[PDB]
Structure 1
Amino acid sequence: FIVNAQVRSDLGKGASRRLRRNAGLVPAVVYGGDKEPQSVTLELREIAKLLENEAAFSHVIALNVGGVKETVLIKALQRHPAKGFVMHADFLRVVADHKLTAHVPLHFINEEVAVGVKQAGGEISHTISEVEVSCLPKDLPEFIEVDMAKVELGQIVHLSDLKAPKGVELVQLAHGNDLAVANIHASR
C-alpha cells in the first residue's frame, strides 16, 4: 500500500476548500511521534481506491512526499457528511517501539454452522465491528477472527470470548467495560 504525497505550503479554510474543487486534491497531515507535524496534500482519486480495500486502516501503508518515505498509518480519517467522499486523510507515523493504537475489522466466519442458527431458529446480530486495539507495529493485524460455531439461541459472545494475534491488547478489556460483540436472537 503506497500513497503519493506533496508539500502543501499554504493553509487555511478557503485554501483547503479550493484544493477540493479546483485541483481535486485533499489536504492531509502526518504528525505522529515526538516529531514535527507535516502538512500534506494528496489526491482524492487514489485515497478512495485505498479505502476500497478491506484492510485500509489496520495496515502499514507506505507514503512518500518526495524521496522521503515513512511507515505511515491512517488514524481518524474525516469524511463529507452528505456525499461521503474523503476530506483530510490525517495520517500517523510509526515509531517502531510503542503501542500504536488503531482499529481492526472483524470477520464472523462460522455463521452457517451455528447451534442457534441450524437447529433452533435464530439469526445473528452484529453489535460491534472494527474493535480498537493497541499493538506493536510488527504484530499489527489486518483482521480479528470471531468464531460463532458454538453460540446458542440466547448466548452472547463478548470480547472476553475473543481471541488472536496474541500481542494485540484490546483497549476495552483494559477497563471494566466488556463489550458484547455479537448475538443470536429469536426472530421478529
Structure 2
Amino acid sequence: DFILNAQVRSDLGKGASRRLRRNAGLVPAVVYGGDKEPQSVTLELREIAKLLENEAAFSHVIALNVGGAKETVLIKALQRHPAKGFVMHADFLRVVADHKLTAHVPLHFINEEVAVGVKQAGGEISHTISEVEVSCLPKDLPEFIEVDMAKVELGQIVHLSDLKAPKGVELVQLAHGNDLAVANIHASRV
C-alpha cells in the first residue's frame, strides 16, 4: 500500500546529508507544491526502496505521514547513485483537488502474440518509449495507458495520436504539436 513515513529534517548541507546516508540509513527529501512553503523531511531507505518496485509507483497517489501529520503527494523526481543505483534523494509534489498535475505514466503493450505483423509477415516489435507525460486532475490520474497492437501490419508506425487516453487526460507532447512514435513493426535483423 502506498504509504510513507517521514520525519522533519532540520540539519541541511553536504556534510549533514552525507551523514544521514552513511550512519542512520536515511534519505533526505522535499515536500513542495500546493500553496505552502517547501518542507524538508527524511525517511528510511529500506522503505522508500520497498515502494519503488510497484509498477504504478510514480502513477499513483501516496499518503505521506510526516511525523504525526498526513498529506497527499506524488513522486515528482528521484535521484539515484550513478554506479550503485540506490536512491539518494526524492522530492514530492503536493496534490490539490482543483489543480492540474503532470506525471510519467508507463505503457502496457497488450496481445503482442496476436499482432498481425508477426504471425503473417514474420515481423518484430520495437517499443520506442515506455512512458508518456500526461496532465490531468488528480481524481482521474491513470495507472497505465494501455496500447493495443493486435491489428498492426508489418512496417506500420504507432504514434501518440493513434492511442486512446481515459476521460480528462492529455498527452502534453501531442498538445504541443509533436506526436513522436510509440512503437513499430520491422523486418527481422538478418
**TM-score normalised by the chain length of structure 1:** 0.98
Structure 1: unaligned runs, 5 residues or longer: none
Deviation at 1:73, TM superposition (A): 0.3
**Correspondences of 1:66-81 after superposition (within 5 Å):** 66-81=67-82
CA distance in 2, matches of 1:104, 1:76: 13
CA distance in 2, matches of 1:149, 1:14: 55
RMSD: 0.7
CA distance in 2, matches of 1:160, 1:130: 15
Deviations 1:18-66 (A, max 9, x none): 1001100000000012210000101110011100100100000111112
CA distance in 1, matches of 2:81, 2:97: 32
Deviation at 1:153, TM superposition (A): 0.6
CA distance in 2, matches of 1:65, 1:166: 33
Structure 2: unaligned runs, 5 residues or longer: none
**TM-score normalised by the chain length of structure 2:** 0.97
Deviation at 1:166, TM superposition (A): 2.1
Deviation at 1:96, TM superposition (A): 1.1
Deviation at 1:183, TM superposition (A): 0.6
Higher strand share: 2
Runs of 4+ displaced beyond 4 Å: none
Deviation at 1:76, TM superposition (A): 1.0
Count residues with an aligned counterpart. Answer: 188
SS of alignment partner, residue 117 of structure 1: helix
**Aligned counterpart, 2:170:** 169
Deviation at 1:176, TM superposition (A): 1.2
CA distance in 2, matches of 1:61, 1:112: 35
Percentage identity across paired residues of the two chains: 99
CA distance in 2, matches of 1:110, 1:182: 14
CA distance in 2, matches of 1:78, 1:97: 28
Higher helix share: 2
CA distance in 2, matches of 1:8, 1:140: 30
Deviations 1:83-138 (A, max 9, x none): 10001111111111111101111100120001111110111000001101011001
CA distance in 2, matches of 1:107, 1:115: 18
CA distance in 2, matches of 1:155, 1:144: 20
